[PDB]
Design a protein around this nucleic acid. Structure first.
Lengths: 700, 300
DNA sequence: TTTTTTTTTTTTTTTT
């Protein structure tokens, strides 16, 4: 028999009772689906976690979906409870979903997540066939739905339908009034007639679901649509995004018929159209709510489009690196280029809610117009299939990129960022979606010229990439940070490390003195230096923090199209559901390191000589940068270009890695008893793998 | 040159080590302030004092604000260590504040307080300019502040401002509701509209800064403002008190915006106003925290 | 005592 069935029979007739199971045999996790925790008593002092998770264990005989007790949510937060792990259940309890007629829900009250399972069989049947239903929904609570395991803007599950194709509708007997006319007469007329518009901007999803509120699929997406008489902001309400979101895209002629015109929202701004001729309507807004007969939205095909209507054409503000160099800040633009680098999918905490996160990742889009790549801060645009599976050597096109500039720092910062109404599309060979635009044709011409010339731009994927480089002087660094939180204590650092969540990144500043720096030939005369101060105070340290370890996934690795899937999966966000690995995968140490140096280990003794720490120094600058003076100092972590070397062909005479390592060690030795201000980078790679890499050493 | 300079140069390179000063020269106390003793280990059976003291001993040349070892607070409880006295420091130590960029701090660890000085100079320069920063703050801690020397219900220091003046806020399109309106509708109002209240009673300050919890300006004052017939016990939190307490007098017409509404604190005792005709709303209370823009509190 | 941010809302009259 199966441990699942044994436990179920053991605790089936004692609902909501904590019962240690008779026998504990490891079970295999196969999925972790997240959803909102609702219908629980929030009066409790430890406010219930905002979200709860369902774990789909398997026992070799049957696989059953379990509801993890929210008290254990920290395990999923730190990615300890992965997919395909050998967890052992120490406590179990039953629970009946009164909103449904089914069986008990095995509740995992206590667990001991272990190691990976060598036998991950997804062919096992489901003990409770209700669990194996086509629409994958949460165990508890009416018509509940699942959210993306990490962020709230990524569509996830099966409710997100993608089967809305154009339909031929005859417009005879239809009025299709102009948007300006509607703006004039939306406060008097009763039956708002039809509208023929074209989507010009599609924005990310917005999850406004709150606990203990009678809300069903609380999603809203903002669409800007334009006709021959202006443009308006169209908003899709809950229960409509699931059916239409994955299908609606920019450039689709829609026929909205039964809508609701409201006064518009003052806390949300309407993006300016690419073509200024389009008159902007700001006093009006169109709300699309799900209706009984699904006719409120119709995707009119292009073939039916008549020039007589003169519908506005989807334009684009495509920009090239050279042009971007001359564009003021906050000047929206579009970028088409070749992905020559992709970074980890890091996460940041929303400033509004402490339990929500943004998923972002840095990518160096590049073109033939300049020698520097577009640095784009790619936040999730509710396009997980493209965002998660993005790889170098791909023609990438984003839609709405706000320009961000900072000239105070000596390394002038010029990186683009994705806006709310942005979009991501991967292009293939000649411009697939945007061939007509001349800039796309020029980019394709450059691609062909490079291909026939035998030149290939260097490619990288993943790694430790703290793009924003701290300024050259601590005063300028602190000009933005508050005085009370500017610095921390070497002792308090431990809590900072222990507070981060999956891929949450943090930057802290610590006051101390470099005591001993050691060089670790990383890839496959003096490498260690010790300070007399260290030899004296090493025996009187209260707590010597040891975080000078570099993980294999923090080393950027040169991309290889053949191992594309493996390389991508080694740096994406943790998948929600297990998927068996094709054949055997290679070793993450089997790929060449895009870096060009070995990592050092820096020991810092606090100003009071009581506490110490061991950070790891991971410079990303090549010796050519040293020779041409593209680095503020040898103790920094980035060259000014903030980009990896391209087709390195000039290291024949330049000092080798060992010479640069000796220079770095000597520079560190120059700071013997000097109170320096280190800038550390704390990133938690999940599964209790927190990397603490040094960024900059601000000397007096 | 000076005793201060000699001792500091002697003990700068040995933080958290106790060294008898090379020379013991009487030094005049020119100031004595009191602040919370957080960041100390509360695991010792003799729990360290809830407050520590900073003494601005002055030599003939300079005066450098020092730190009094909490074990010496007995000399201040009896007022034996007062301003204007002459004392002979016997033990010193160097401590570095890890939340500020600055030089070492002299840690007084044993004194022999004598008698009043014959000549006290208030014009002696400050050796360390950091000590001379106009918004005076305690030597230890990041955003710490000095309390009053003896009682905790008296504003003290430069954090307390009196610069607030009446402002002519236009009421062209300001949505002003009544207190009873919130009383009936405050659990459904996603946004709480503006208010136009008038102060009736202003309470004495209350310091709730415990040593272990990390709080900034643990100052809290309860103001009984009454808009229209209704009256509620508004309560200002955190660092809002030392920006509006020395300025707000009873009878000032306040315009509170971007506020919060919650349940009345269980042990709260709302005072009855002079006029009985008013309604004493005692179910919900408006909390005024420091919003990033300075529009939350505007007096008309 | 402490404690912040976010959106959601459907419907049968007028003629002068």
């Amino acid at each position: 028999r199966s441990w699942i069935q044994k436990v179920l029979e053991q605790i089936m007739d004692s609902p909501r009772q904590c019962v240690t199971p008779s026998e504990v045999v490891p079970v295999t996790v196969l999925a972790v689906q997240r959803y909102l925790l609702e219908d629980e008593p929030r009066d409790t002092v430890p406010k219930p976690p905002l979200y709860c998770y369902d774990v789909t264990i398997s026992d070799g005989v049957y696989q059953e979906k379990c509801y993890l007790d929210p008290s254990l949510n920290s395990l999923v937060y730190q990615n300890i409870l992965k997919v395909g792990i050998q967890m052992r259940i120490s406590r179990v309890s039953c629970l009946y979903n009164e909103k449904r007629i089914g069986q008990g829900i095995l509740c995992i009250d206590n667990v001991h997540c272990g190691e990976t399972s060598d036998s991950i069989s997804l062919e096992t049947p489901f003990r409770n066939r209700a669990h194996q239903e086509k629409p994958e929904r949460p165990l508890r609570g009416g018509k509940s739905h699942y959210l993306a395991l990490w962020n709230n803007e990524d569509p996830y599950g099966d409710i997100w339908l993608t089967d809305k194709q154009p339909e031929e509708h005859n417009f005879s007997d239809t009025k299709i009034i102009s948007l300006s006319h509607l703006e004039m007469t939306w406060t008097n007329r009763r039956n708002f007639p039809a509208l023929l518009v074209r989507i010009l901007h599609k924005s990310k999803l917005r999850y406004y679901g709150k606990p203990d509120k009678k809300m069903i699929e609380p999603y809203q997406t903002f669409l800007e649509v334009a006709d021959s008489s202006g443009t308006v902001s169209v908003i899709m309400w809950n229960a409509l995004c699931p059916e239409w979101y994955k299908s609606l895209r920019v450039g689709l002629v829609l026929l909205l018929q039964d809508y609701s015109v409201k006064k518009s929202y003052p806390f949300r701004i309407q993006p300016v159209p690419v073509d200024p001729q389009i008159k902007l309507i700001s006093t009006m807004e169109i709300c699309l709510n799900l209706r009984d007969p699904p006719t409120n939205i119709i995707i009119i095909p292009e073939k039916q489009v008549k020039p007589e209507w003169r519908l506005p054409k989807l334009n684009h503000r495509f920009t090239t690196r050279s042009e971007l160099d001359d564009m003021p800040e906050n000047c929206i633009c579009d970028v088409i280029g070749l992905l020559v680098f992709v970074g980890r999918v890091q996460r940041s905490k929303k400033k509004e809610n402490r339990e929500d996160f943004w998923s972002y990742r840095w990518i160096h889009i590049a073109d033939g117009t300049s020698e520097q790549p577009f640095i784009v801060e790619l936040f999730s645009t509710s396009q997980p299939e493209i965002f998660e599976n993005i790889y170098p050597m791909a023609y990438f096109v984003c839609t709405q990129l706000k320009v961000v500039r900072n000239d105070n720092q000596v390394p002038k910062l010029l990186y683009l960022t994705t806006t709310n109404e942005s979009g991501v599309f991967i292009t293939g060979h000649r411009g697939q979606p945007y061939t007509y635009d001349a800039k796309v044709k020029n980019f394709i011409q450059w691609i062909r010229t490079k291909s026939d010339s035998g030149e290939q731009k260097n490619m990288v994927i993943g790694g430790y990439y703290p793009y924003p480089p701290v300024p050259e002087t601590f005063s300028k660094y602190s000009s933005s940070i508050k005085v009370e939180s500017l610095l921390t204590a070497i002792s308090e650092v431990r809590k900072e490390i222990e507070d981060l969540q999956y891929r949450e990144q943090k930057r802290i500043a610590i006051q101390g003195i470099i005591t001993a720096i050691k060089y670790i030939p990383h890839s496959s005369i003096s490498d260690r230096w010790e300070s007399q101060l260290w030899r004296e105070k090493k025996f009187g340290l209260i707590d010597h923090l040891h975080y000078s370890r570099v993980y294999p996934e923090s080393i950027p690795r040169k991309f290889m199209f053949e191992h594309r899937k493996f390389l991508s999966d080694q740096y994406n966000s943790q998948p929600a559901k297990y998927v068996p690995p094709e054949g055997r995968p290679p070793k993450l140490d089997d790929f060449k390191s895009a870096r060009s140096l070995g990592h050092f280990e820096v020991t810092i003794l606090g100003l009071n000589h009581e506490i110490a720490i061991d950070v790891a120094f991971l410079p990303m600058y090549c010796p050519e940068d040293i020779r041409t003076s593209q680095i503020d100092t040898l103790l920094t972590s980035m060259n000014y270009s903030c980009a990896y070397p391209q087709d390195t062909t000039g290291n024949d005479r330049l000092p080798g890695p060992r010479a640069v390592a000796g220079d770095i060690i000597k520079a560190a030795t120059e700071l013997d008893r000097v109170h320096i201000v280190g800038i550390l980078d704390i990133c938690n790679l999940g599964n209790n793998k927190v990397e603490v890499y040094l960024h900059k050493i601000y000397s007096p």
